[PDB]
Design a protein around this ligand. Structure first.
Ligand code: Q83
Ligand code: NAG
Ligand code: NAG
Ligand code: NAG
Ligand code: NAG
Ligand code: NAG
Lengths: 324, 417, 248, 98, 49
């Protein structure tokens, strides 16, 4: 407050006290929006109590997961697909802001620990099933794991057991196209960038609003004190003080209003990570279009990404029916 | 530590981390820089002289390249009026002025109240007018002994009739018959035709309201461009790289000075940035360009285990490198450099625990010969499943469990008058 | 006899350094894409243009020439011996400024005879009761000795506020034949004179080469209150602008 | 100590100052009363699906497999007690598809 | 802003600029509530291709 309103002046600093402690409340309000942000990310990812390890030998029946599993050669141990989402969102002077008492704090959880949480859910979803969500993990071969999910939508087991190769090939070819889709256009992540553009375009208006008279001789405290005696300068410094104390409250009010819309999105993501990724969902159009089979998570800067697998019929025909 | 008890207004504090204030540095000495000039301004030719002009045709003179020391008038001159607009009388000895001018004329006694912005009368309507945004001073004194004689003095005139009103700082020295009726004057005085100029009659026995007076007006501009007239102050040397106070042709401030690369034009003296602040200047005795930067920036925080346990604390600096730390309030060899700043007063360790006080960037601190330690937060245990293509596991028992959950529902109702 | 100026006429509104920023101001500017007049002086029917024109709030003046045929201006209200007037002249030896009560002629002009020399100077008949004068140091200036296409351009701005006369100027070399080129350039402060008179008219005075009734022309445009948006370089110069009310 | 003409000038400043601290309070109360509504909607939705029936949604009414639940009342809030089923004591075998 | 605060006055219009561009932000805030209203009705009814 003092470095933004007055500066290095001691007369302004002494005059400020008369208005009383009016922005300790502003700081109280601002400090309650950071603990909430820290708590938001710990309800989406920190849902596993144990860190599982990816099996070394790959015997999965014909399914290829090599593009959504950690790559030790790549630094930071990130999957191939995860590295394309980090090159499509850009975090775009800061010296001017720092000279007026404005700073930015770092988050508690580094981007390297967030990738260690999504590599355990993936490893436990392929070797156990839904048995690791409640209790202890119990192994099951993958091919017999898919039969359960087929029975869960109405079809029978022999349908899956008699068309294994075709289904595996379809899955491989379907998941091999996301890479090329995401390696061409950078506008896909259009909603993860609006939050960055805001909260960054609104911190420059504060700095720009320091060059406006509010009904005074000028807008510099070193030109009103170089020509007038204290009795006259006190009259015209109060107008600047009250003008500059008004633009620090709209910012806080708008931040308070707009920080209540990310909490709903975080709650929705937390609810969607427990029902589509740790089980099978019967709710219509909740975890995709079609009949839900399984899903996999991934991490992006300031957000999360989901991949949904569904079942779709085709090639119908006409017959004749009778009730009995 | 004592800066937080005052902030939260109590004698007791609890576990946590607080923000306090930033880092400040104070100036060491002062400095002044003025142009060097020796000549003294013409205080004699202007104020007390031989003869003055008339109101309807006044005079104007230009002053430049001199030093203003008005204390030399204390001996003789005695003024009855003195007013200044846009500046303070007590601040006139530290400034430098630009584009100065002086006006002189003689008027009656009780007509000196009309020399001011926003007035009506026969002197402010046809002879002399002042702008609305004036900057200067007005001076007058009584001169009955030097402009009166027995039989009257008839060498001072003033305009009496006009068609419209003047405009600020305008003059009119024309004589032409004035038609006050519907009959054209035709160049010869007669009925409804008058000579616009009249005369003042001054006698030594007239009342106090009918005696001559002398007036002088001063006008200038302040703190916008190069100046050539300065007050009675002294110069100093140039200390460059350290926080000091300065005075540059009347401008005051504090900061650090350094050599720049910009190139000013001949008619420029100051620079500005996106916000209305000064960051460049030209030295008036060397013709060079300098830069100005503030002296304070950087935050701090305090880590305490609660005032009911001990009186030790640790301090975190968020914009410093502990390898070579030039800024530190006190700075015991317990220096640890994290990724969120610099920590003083805490001991590093190797093992990991569950976070107690979150410092940030994947670090935590807790109180545990007790002291404070700073470990790295751990994620959890580790496990590995036995995946084979022909193996399965099945339970053989069960358990019953009970848990709780809490949710707020309502609030409190209130009213105000 | 009618031409439009696209984006010409801009002057520095203050004396302060600035760089890499956009600034907004309100002043008296010459609008964009506005009508402008053309005056000729050509001897094949000979022509000699020096009419009396109004002076509303300001004036933008431009002249393109190869041989010096434009010298100065005269300002006033009634241009007679009943009021005060102003004179700016160039008598080929130094610059002269005078504020007296003149009795001007009907067709003022100057002239040369030969080689070339300055012989005739017929402007006024009498001057009396005046209180302002200034004369510049002497110089020697070339006369005639040229022929071809236009080579030089000069621009001026005149204002009259609170008994003050302000002038901005700038000079640019161009090669062209029969028009005024296009581009961008800002004008800089020149001088500020205290006079204190009412001005509502003006006129131009030329020279002739031992002839009666070689190639040159000048333009004229007025000023209006407007608001603009200006752009600065990294060095500190203005390079582009936009008018905030030309169109939606 | 002052006549009305001089007292009004310095009473207007007090009036405008004191009229500003009564609006921040109302704005903050309005902002902060919109979260209790979200909490009370969740409580109402949770009282109709875990107490008046059996839920198949994962981790909605506790950890495990849902059997039944009971409500209780607390000052300005509510409390739930959940009963679940948990396996134990696993073993290894051999498996074949058909 | 100008038609509500000042009216047809030019002195008021000239004096307003000193306070700066304080309601371009108001208009920015107001214009973001209309696109949202337009999008609200397209997620309830436009569910059939
Ligand atoms: O009544 C008094 O006790 C003294 C009042 C006189 C104050 C003179 C003054 O403040 N200035 C400012 C700049 C300047 C330039 C030239 C002259 N000059 O007339 O020589 C005077 C002044
Ligand atoms: C007044 O003028 C006379 C004329 O010479 C001069 O001697 C005198 O010094 C002047 N007044 C003052 C105070 O100097
Ligand atoms: C006085 O100012 C002039 C102007 O640049 C400068 O050349 C001269 O050195 C100065 N005098 C001293 C003693 O520095
Ligand atoms: C404070 O410290 C005392 C001394 O150990 C301890 O008995 C007490 O429980 C602590 N807390 C409070 C609230 O007194
Ligand atoms: C802790 O780690 C440091 C750095 O590697 C090492 O020098 C030290 O010996 C370790 N402590 C113990 C007890 O081994
Ligand atoms: C304005 O310029 C156009 C272009 O030739 C011309 O036709 C018109 O007459 C000019 N305006 C007036 C009032 O003449």
């Amino acid at each position: 407050c003092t470095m933004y309103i007055c500066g290095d002046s001691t007369e302004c600093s002494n005059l400020l006290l008369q208005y009383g402690s009016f922005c300790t409340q502003l700081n109280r309000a601002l400090t309650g929006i950071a603990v909430e942000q820290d708590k938001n990310t710990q309800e989406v990812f920190a849902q596993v109590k144990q860190i599982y390890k990816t099996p070394p030998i790959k015997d999965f029946g014909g399914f290829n997961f090599s593009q959504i599993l950690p790559d030790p050669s790549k630094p930071s141990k990130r999957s191939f697909i995860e590295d394309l989402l980090f090159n499509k969102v850009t975090l775009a002077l800061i010296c001017a802001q720092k000279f007026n008492g404005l700073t930015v704090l770092p988050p508690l959880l580094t981007d390297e620990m967030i990738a260690q949480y999504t590599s355990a859910l993936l490893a436990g979803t392929i070797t156990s099933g839904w048995t690791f969500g409640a209790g202890a993990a119990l192994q099951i071969p993958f091919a017999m794991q898919m039969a359960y999910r087929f029975n869960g939508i109405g079809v029978t087991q022999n349908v899956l057991y008699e068309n294994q190769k075709l289904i595996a090939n379809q899955f491989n070819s379907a998941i091999g196209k996301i890479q090329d889709s995401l390696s061409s256009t950078a506008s896909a992540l259009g909603k993860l960038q609006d939050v960055v553009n805001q909260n960054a375009q609104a911190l420059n208006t504060l700095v720009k609003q320091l060059s406006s008279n509010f009904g005074a001789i000028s807008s510099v405290l070193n030109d009103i004190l170089s020509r007038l005696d204290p009795p006259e300068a006190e009259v015209q410094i109060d107008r600047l003080i009250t003008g500059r104390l008004q633009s620090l409250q709209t910012y806080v009010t708008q931040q308070l209003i707009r920080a209540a819309e990310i909490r709903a999105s975080a709650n929705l993501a937390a609810t969607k990570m427990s029902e589509c990724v740790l089980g099978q969902s019967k709710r219509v159009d909740f975890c995709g279009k079609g009949y839900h089979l399984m899903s996999f998570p991934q991490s992006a800067p300031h957000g999360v990404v989901f991949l949904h697998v569904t079942y779709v019929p085709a090639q119908e025909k006409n017959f004749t029916t009778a009730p009995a | 530590l004592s800066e937080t008890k005052c902030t939260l207004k109590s004698f007791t504090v609890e576990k946590g981390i607080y923000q306090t204030s930033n880092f400040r540095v104070q100036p060491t000495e002062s400095i002044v820089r003025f142009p060097n000039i020796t000549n003294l301004c013409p205080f004699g030719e202007v104020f007390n002289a031989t003869r003055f002009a008339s109101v309807y045709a006044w005079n104007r003179k230009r002053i430049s390249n001199c030093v203003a020391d008005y204390s030399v008038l204390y001996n003789s001159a005695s003024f009855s009026t003195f007013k200044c607009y846009g500046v303070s009388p007590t601040k006139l000895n530290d400034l430098c002025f630009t584009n100065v001018y002086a006006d002189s004329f003689v008027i009656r006694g009780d007509e000196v109240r009309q020399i001011a912005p926003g007035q009506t009368g026969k002197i402010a309507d046809y002879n002399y007018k002042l702008p609305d945004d004036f900057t200067g001073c007005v001076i007058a004194w009584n001169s009955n002994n030097l402009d009166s004689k027995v039989g009257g003095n008839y060498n001072y005139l003033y305009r009496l009739f006009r068609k419209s009103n003047l405009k600020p700082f305008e003059r009119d020295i024309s004589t032409e018959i004035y038609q006050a009726g519907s009959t054209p004057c035709n160049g010869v005085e007669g009925f409804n035709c008058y000579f616009p100029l009249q005369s003042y009659g001054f006698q030594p026995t007239n009342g106090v309201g009918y005696q001559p007076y002398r007036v002088v007006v001063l006008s200038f501009e302040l703190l916008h461009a190069p100046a050539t007239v300065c007050g009675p102050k002294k110069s100093t040397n140039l200390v460059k790289n350290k926080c000091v106070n300065f005075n540059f042709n009347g401008l005051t401030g504090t900061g650090v000075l350094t050599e720049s690369n910009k190139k000013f034009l001949p008619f420029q003296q100051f620079g500005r940035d996106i916000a209305d602040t000064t960051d460049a200047v030209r030295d008036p005795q060397t013709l060079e360009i300098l830069d100005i930067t503030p002296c304070s920036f950087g935050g701090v925080s305090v880590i305490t285990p609660g005032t009911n346990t001990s009186n030790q604390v640790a301090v975190l600096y968020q914009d410093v490198n502990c390898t070579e730390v030039p800024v530190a309030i006190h700075a015991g060899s317990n220096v640890f450099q994290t990724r969120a700043g610099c920590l003083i007063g805490a001991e590093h360790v190797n093992n990991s625990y569950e976070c107690d006080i979150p410092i940030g960037a994947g670090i935590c601190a807790s109180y545990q010969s007790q002291s404070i330690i700073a470990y790295t937060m751990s994620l959890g245990a580790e496990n590995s499943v036995a995946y084979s293509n022909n193996s399965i596991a099945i339970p053989t028992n069960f358990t019953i469990s009970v848990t709780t959950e809490i949710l707020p529902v309502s609030m409190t109702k209130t009213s105000v008058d | 006899a009618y031409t439009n100026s696209f984006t010409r006429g801009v002057y520095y509104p203050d004396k302060v350094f600035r760089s890499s920023v956009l600034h907004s101001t309100q002043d008296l500017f010459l609008p964009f894409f506005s009508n402008v007049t053309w005056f000729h002086a050509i001897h094949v029917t000979k022509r000699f243009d020096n009419p009396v024109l109004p002076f509303n709030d300001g004036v933008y003046f431009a002249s393109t020439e190869k041989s010096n045929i434009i010298r100065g201006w005269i300002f006033g209200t009634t241009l007679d011996s009943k009021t005060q007037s102003l004179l700016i002249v160039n008598n080929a030896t130094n610059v002269v400024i005078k504020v007296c009560e003149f009795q001007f002629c009907n067709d003022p002009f100057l002239g040369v005879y030969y080689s070339w020399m300055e012989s005739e100077f017929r402007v006024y008949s009498s001057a009396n009761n005046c209180t302002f004068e200034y004369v510049s140091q002497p110089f020697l200036m070339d006369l005639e000795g040229k022929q071809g296409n236009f080579k030089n351009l000069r621009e001026f701005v005149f204002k009259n506020i609170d008994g003050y006369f302000k002038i901005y100027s700038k000079h640019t070399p161009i090669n062209l034949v029969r028009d005024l080129p296009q581009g961008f350039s800002a004008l800089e402060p020149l001088v500020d004179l205290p006079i204190g008179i009412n001005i509502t008219r003006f006129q131009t005075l030329l020279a002739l080469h031992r002839s009666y009734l070689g190639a040159a022309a000048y333009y004229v445009g007025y000023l209006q209150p407007r608001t603009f948006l200006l752009k600065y370089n990294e060095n500190g110069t203005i390079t582009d602008a936009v008018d905030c009310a030309l169109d939606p």
